[PDB]
Design a protein around this motif. Structure first.
Motif, PDB file in Angstrom:
ATOM      1  N   UNK B  76       0.520  -0.779  -0.068  1.00 18.02           N
ATOM      2  CA  UNK B  76       0.027   0.173  -0.289  1.00 18.02           C
ATOM      3  C   UNK B  76       0.854   0.957   0.347  1.00 18.02           C
ATOM      4  N   UNK B  77       1.664   1.465   0.852  1.00 19.57           N
ATOM      5  CA  UNK B  77       3.133   2.546   0.459  1.00 19.57           C
ATOM      6  C   UNK B  77       3.609   2.456  -0.972  1.00 19.57           C
ATOM      7  N   UNK B  79       1.955   1.438  -3.740  1.00 23.06           N
ATOM      8  CA  UNK B  79       1.268   1.789  -4.406  1.00 23.06           C
ATOM      9  C   UNK B  79       0.839   3.369  -4.447  1.00 23.06           C
ATOM     10  N   UNK B  80       1.044   3.993  -3.082  1.00 22.34           N
ATOM     11  CA  UNK B  80       0.567   5.265  -2.146  1.00 22.34           C
ATOM     12  C   UNK B  80       1.766   6.500  -3.136  1.00 22.34           C
ATOM     13  N   UNK B  81       3.111   5.735  -3.110  1.00 14.47           N
ATOM     14  CA  UNK B  81       3.934   6.497  -4.168  1.00 14.47           C
ATOM     15  C   UNK B  81       3.601   6.896  -5.183  1.00 14.47           C
ATOM     16  N   UNK B  83       1.030   6.477  -7.092  1.00 11.25           N
ATOM     17  CA  UNK B  83       0.212   7.688  -7.167  1.00 11.25           C
ATOM     18  C   UNK B  83       0.503   8.903  -6.623  1.00 11.25           C
TER      19      UNK B  83
END
Lengths: 140, 137
Positions: B76-77, B79-81, B83
């Protein structure tokens, strides 16, 4: 003997729905993570521009001894300098857009973004001033 | 020397303008060069960052070290970075497409680099969703 296309696609759709459900149930965590990364990138952007502006500010008053070089050559040097600076005038515009969008979203670092922006606009306006001062004060 | 240093700043100022359009072509030539330089340096930066990401999106797949909760947090980190950085290629499109629309001299090189950047960004996204789904197994 064969599996229908509809059954095969439905199996894929179920995998997707499960995946989407999990992302949706963790929307808050995902939001905060992305917000942190967006600020990190913005700071990286601001630092890159800031380092450049200072480099060109050092130059806009450096190598200034007396200039035993042709007035023509010094002229076209400054024209080159002016062209570079004009080529980069888009950098500050992009920072604004990025920073202001986060600000409009209530980003947790709004205040730090706000002051970072006015500080870059200040260094930028300065560079344009010392560039003009150098421009006319070689024709005099 | 008072008159000497006045002939100079008159001779140059005289040739400094013979036809404005030719002067315009000249600094247009200088601006195009630096505009190209900025684009190239920005493209290589995004190019470098994207490749580092595709690689990470495949180090250890099914290992023993980390538990499910930890692996899901790490993903999830990730994907976060990614995006968070989706504006990077947007700005390059804007800058590169503007040069193309003007008839800039390196149009072909620019068009080609934008195409390849999008292709790699698209499969970073693809691979990313694959890894995510794979973790739900």
């Amino acid at each position: 003997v064969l599996e229908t296309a509809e059954d095969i696609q439905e199996r894929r759709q179920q995998v997707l729905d499960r995946y989407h459900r999990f992302k949706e149930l963790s929307t808050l965590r995902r939001q905060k993570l992305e917000d942190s990364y967006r600020f990190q990138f913005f700071q990286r952007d601001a630092e890159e521009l800031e380092k450049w502006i200072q480099e060109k500010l050092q130059i806009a008053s450096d190598e200034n001894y007396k200039d035993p070089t042709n007035l023509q050559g010094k002229l076209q040097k400054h024209q080159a300098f002016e062209a570079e600076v004009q080529a980069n005038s888009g950098a500050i515009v992009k920072l604004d857009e990025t920073g202001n969008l986060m600000i409009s979203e209530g980003h947790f670092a709004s205040e730090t973004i706000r002051t970072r922006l006015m500080e870059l606009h200040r260094q930028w306006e300065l560079l344009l001033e010392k560039m003009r001062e150098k421009g006319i004060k070689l024709l005099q």
